[PDB]
Ligand binder design. Structure first.
Ligand SMILES: [Cl-]
Ligand SMILES: [Cl-]
Length: 129
């Protein structure tokens, strides 16, 4: 599924991401925009053989099992394919674990490089939330 901007914001709000660990909703929508262009099916392969999955580009070396990342830790206890569903619940639940692990949203390179320190509230502007 390719979400709309406000569609994703409301789905993320419903799943408790607004202000989760202090990150307002605009941060999550901005991260998903630049990580995956709001596409739940986005996958990108990394040089280390790990792969990023889904709307928040969650990585197979640490967070999900994709059967082909040796030394994966599967800390979200899910197959990476679950992260590609049109239901974002598994992505959201795993992202909460990621953002809680010490480094906040700096775990998402696109958030660090393209959302952090910008007016992330612009990403939910005009949405019925
Ligand atoms: Cl915001
Ligand atoms: Cl980037």
């Amino acid at each position: 599924k390719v979400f709309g901007r406000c569609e994703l914001a409301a789905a993320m709000k419903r799943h408790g991401l607004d202000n989760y660990r202090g990150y307002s909703l605009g941060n999550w929508v901005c991260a998903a925009k630049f990580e995956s262009n709001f596409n739940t099916q986005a996958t990108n392969r990394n040089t280390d053989g790990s792969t990023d999955y889904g709307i928040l580009q969650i990585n197979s070396r640490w967070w999900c099992n994709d059967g082909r990342t040796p030394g994966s830790r599967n800390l979200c206890n899910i197959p990476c394919s679950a992260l590609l569903s049109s239901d974002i619940t598994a992505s959201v639940n795993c992202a909460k674990k990621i953002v809680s692990d010490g480094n906040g949203m700096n775990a998402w390179v696109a958030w660090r490089n393209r959302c952090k320190g910008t007016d992330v509230q612009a990403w939910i502007r005009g949405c019925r939330l």
